[PDB]
Design a binder for these strands. Structure first.
Ligand SMILES: [Cl-]
Ligand SMILES: [Cl-]
Ligand SMILES: [Cl-]
Ligand SMILES: [Cl-]
Ligand SMILES: [Cl-]
Ligand SMILES: [Cl-]
Ligand SMILES: [Cl-]
Ligand SMILES: [Mg+2]
Ligand SMILES: [Mg+2]
Ligand SMILES: [Mg+2]
Ligand SMILES: [Mg+2]
Ligand SMILES: [Mg+2]
Ligand SMILES: [Mg+2]
Ligand SMILES: [Mg+2]
Ligand SMILES: [Mg+2]
Ligand SMILES: [Mg+2]
Ligand SMILES: [Mg+2]
Ligand SMILES: [Mg+2]
Ligand SMILES: [Mg+2]
Ligand SMILES: [Mg+2]
Ligand SMILES: [Mg+2]
Ligand SMILES: [Mg+2]
Ligand SMILES: [Mg+2]
Ligand code: NA
Ligand code: NA
Ligand code: NA
Ligand code: NA
Ligand code: NA
Ligand code: NA
Ligand code: NA
Ligand code: NA
Ligand code: NA
Ligand code: NA
Ligand code: NA
Ligand code: NA
Ligand code: NA
Ligand code: NA
Ligand code: NA
Ligand code: NA
Lengths: 150, 142, 142, 49
RNA sequence: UGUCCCAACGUUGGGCCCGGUGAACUGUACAUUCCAGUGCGGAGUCUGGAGACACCCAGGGGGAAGCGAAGACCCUAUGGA
RNA sequence: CGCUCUAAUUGGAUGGAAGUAGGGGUGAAAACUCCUAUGGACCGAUUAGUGACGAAAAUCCUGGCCAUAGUAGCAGCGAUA
RNA sequence: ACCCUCAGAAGGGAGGCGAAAUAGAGCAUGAAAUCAGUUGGCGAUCGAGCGACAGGGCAUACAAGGUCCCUCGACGAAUGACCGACGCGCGAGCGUCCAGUAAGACUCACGGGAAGCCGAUGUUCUGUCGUACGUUUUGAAAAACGAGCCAGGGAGUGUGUCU
């Protein structure tokens, strides 16, 4: 798995990670990209709206065939990745909790750094026509999050 | 409180007029990179030189713009070939005994990278006392 | 609107190509040029064949397109563009520092370039850009 | 016999594959094949005196 | 008698948008092209021009002498059956 | 010029070897060498030998990996639940 | 180990051991292809063998390179004048003299200047040249054949005889 790729001052910082999550790595890059710079609390509200379907996540890189969304500003394609979003909510719940156990005001902290990394694939095989089988795998994702005092 | 290199770091060699002229020429003229053809088009093809052999190779045929082909005509002046840019002739050194016979006016010494700090210290102090410059000196805080 | 032209050229009764060739040369030298009275510029030859050529250019085209100007305005400017490497940075810079005008929006009267004037008293086979545009279907806005 | 203990055969043309002896869909025997024979190996018969 | 004149409207499953799952084919490189020319005589890439702000969605498949298969035709081999 | 191991002669290394990454110098070049970080135990030079000794290619072999793509399929069957 | 978190013997946070956890369990080292984030350069008006050689922008901790810029002056190969004087030509222009002079690449010396400053490196812009590589072929950029990319593997060897 990963290690934190950015330095973090322990006195004004809180950390968290997800390990080998079986979820879309592409949905993860998009989500991380969108919530960085946000407040922990803002991020939580944002992802809940995504899960609810009232807020789209801009898909700027993995957008082939993706329909346009009116709420996406400065871009067109977007979706509502609920699974990856739920995993991020778990990530934030942890971070904010770690933050609190350290004396900070979790929710109010800024997401200084957030990033997903594909750590592997749970390999699978799908039988096909003509007596042949082909790959049918699941991405495994690690993700780091660093909260920092305003 | 600051880093200082050991030895005669500033020392320069004394060269005949003709040698300094040829050293200056080499530095002015230079040479082409002489990297293998198309090394930049394929990652699996490294920079290390290989004679282009293709019957149709544009470089092998000498087409302008496809890079120079290695030839003896590109050789550096005999009198200066191999000299450190400073004009000194290098002498690879592994220990204190290697310093024996070395002309500090004409040669500078390069301590092999494998030599440890304990032996480098001895080599560096006696080289300086022999008037020999050490191209790769230790930097101590003084 | 407002064009700090370092040179204001009068095309009235002048050979379009000979003017264009000079305006090109000058714009590539850094000069900002304005061609005045384009509609009154002229080209030698048999009106019938001349017009056929320009008419052919209008009809040429396809989805990719071949936008050929009909007004004496653009005809002249396109003529100049053909004497400039308009796709290179330098070429486009020069071309963009040249503007052609119908009539004269300036106070000063432009100058007449050497060897570009046509003597109407010793020439009968020639045509006016304005006439060409009228034949092409342009809207005589002059 | 290192590398030769196999009945691997080449399929020949037809499947967009190089003509290399294969067995159980795995290449074998030929020198460019992993697990294949050594083309010109050291030999006992050589007079080293 | 919708085979046709000559096509229309409708029904169900898709298609389209959303959650989840999640391959393959294919890939020398570069690549926004078009008209002509040239070239081993069938060029996105050479030459001259023309056109060309970037990204994305849906479509029917004009081109990549598209992908798929070391041509079955034909000849050649001091080949095979 | 470079690679393996042998021999003689002779050196380096826990005061940090090999390897790797980035960087400096030399050689027309094969390639040599130094610095910094990583690494944490081995490594050379000269001479005479040795050879399962040098790859961009073989629809080459094996493994890994990107685009393809969040795309095709997860509808079609007289059993539509 | 303990504590916080969690649906939780998961995972995460904090913490503990050890020279080292970036030695934490398929765990020595940890290349390339390649992915995430991020830095430098370019960037939504513009053209494609991706470069070589020249030359500019912008970027750069140290180390292992230390040079480079401008005045002037010295030297100065080939080449080599303007102006002016005189003489020709219808004319463009030429001849003689000034003069093989002034000039003239490199190199050096005095004085002055630079430390992102010179080299070098990354990227980008401009100029010149440029339709991969290997093979087949009289002729390959080829609408002839091969390869998605990278790493590792992958082809004159032995005995006998003869020369
Ligand atoms: Cl993925
Ligand atoms: Cl030589
Ligand atoms: Cl058109
Ligand atoms: Cl141009
Ligand atoms: Cl006339
Ligand atoms: Cl010189
Ligand atoms: Cl041979
Ligand atoms: Mg779609
Ligand atoms: Mg079956
Ligand atoms: Mg390369
Ligand atoms: Mg084997
Ligand atoms: Mg073109
Ligand atoms: Mg065939
Ligand atoms: Mg037959
Ligand atoms: Mg037969
Ligand atoms: Mg010896
Ligand atoms: Mg080859
Ligand atoms: Mg493979
Ligand atoms: Mg598709
Ligand atoms: Mg029913
Ligand atoms: Mg390890
Ligand atoms: Mg032929
Ligand atoms: Mg290899
Ligand atoms: Na995209
Ligand atoms: Na939008
Ligand atoms: Na919007
Ligand atoms: Na004319
Ligand atoms: Na037209
Ligand atoms: Na066997
Ligand atoms: Na033997
Ligand atoms: Na019907
Ligand atoms: Na098509
Ligand atoms: Na293949
Ligand atoms: Na540069
Ligand atoms: Na061939
Ligand atoms: Na070729
Ligand atoms: Na062709
Ligand atoms: Na593939
Ligand atoms: Na071999």
């Amino acid at each position: 798995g990963i290690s934190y790729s950015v330095e973090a001052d322990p006195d004004t910082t809180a950390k968290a990670m997800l390990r080998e999550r079986q979820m879309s790595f592409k949905h993860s890059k998009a989500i991380a990209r969108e919530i960085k710079g946000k407040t922990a609390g803002e991020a939580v509200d944002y992802l809940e709206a995504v899960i609810e379907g009232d807020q789209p996540v801009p898909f700027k890189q993995h957008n082939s065939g993706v329909g346009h969304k009116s709420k996406v500003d400065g871009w067109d394609a977007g979706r509502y990745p609920e699974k990856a979003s739920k995993a991020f909510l778990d990530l934030l719940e942890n971070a904010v909790g770690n933050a609190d156990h350290q004396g900070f005001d979790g929710e109010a902290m800024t997401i200084k750094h957030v990033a997903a990394h594909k750590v592997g694939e749970q390999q699978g095989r799908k039988p096909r026509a003509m007596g042949r089988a082909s790959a049918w795998n699941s991405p495994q994702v690690d993700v780091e999050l660093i909260l920092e005092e305003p | 409180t600051e880093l200082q290199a050991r030895g005669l770091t500033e020392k320069t060699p004394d060269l005949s007029d003709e040698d300094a002229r040829l050293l200056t020429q080499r530095h002015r003229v230079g040479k082409p990179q002489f990297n293998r053809q198309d090394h930049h088009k394929k990652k699996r093809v490294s920079t290390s030189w290989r004679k282009p052999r293709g019957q149709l190779s544009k470089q092998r045929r000498g087409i302008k713009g496809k890079g120079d082909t290695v030839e003896a005509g590109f050789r550096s002046p005999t009198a200066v070939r191999g000299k450190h840019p400073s004009g000194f002739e290098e002498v690879r050194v592994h220990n204190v005994d290697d310093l024996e016979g070395v002309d500090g006016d004409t040669e500078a010494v390069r301590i092999a990278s494998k030599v440890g700090a304990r032996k480098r210290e001895r080599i560096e102090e006696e080289a300086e006392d022999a008037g020999i410059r050490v191209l790769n000196p230790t930097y101590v805080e003084v | 609107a407002e064009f700090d032209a370092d040179v204001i050229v009068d095309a009235r009764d002048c050979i379009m190509g000979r003017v264009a060739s000079q305006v090109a040369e000058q714009a590539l030298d850094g000069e900002t040029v304005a061609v005045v009275n384009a509609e009154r510029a002229v080209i030698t030859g048999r009106e019938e064949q001349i017009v056929e050529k320009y008419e052919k250019r209008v009809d040429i085209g396809n989805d990719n397109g071949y936008f050929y100007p009909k007004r004496p305005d653009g005809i002249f400017k396109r003529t100049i563009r053909g004497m400039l490497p308009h796709k290179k940075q330098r070429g486009r810079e020069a071309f963009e520092s040249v503007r052609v005008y119908l009539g004269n929006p300036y106070d000063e009267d432009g100058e007449v370039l050497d060897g570009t004037s046509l003597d109407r008293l010793s020439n009968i086979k020639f045509v006016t850009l304005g006439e060409i545009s009228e034949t092409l279907g342009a809207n005589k806005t002059w | 016999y290192a590398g030769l203990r196999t009945p691997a055969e080449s399929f020949g043309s037809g499947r967009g594959q190089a003509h290399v002896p294969k067995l159980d869909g795995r290449a074998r025997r030929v020198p460019q094949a992993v697990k294949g024979r050594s083309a010109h190996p050291p030999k006992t018969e050589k007079d080293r005196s």
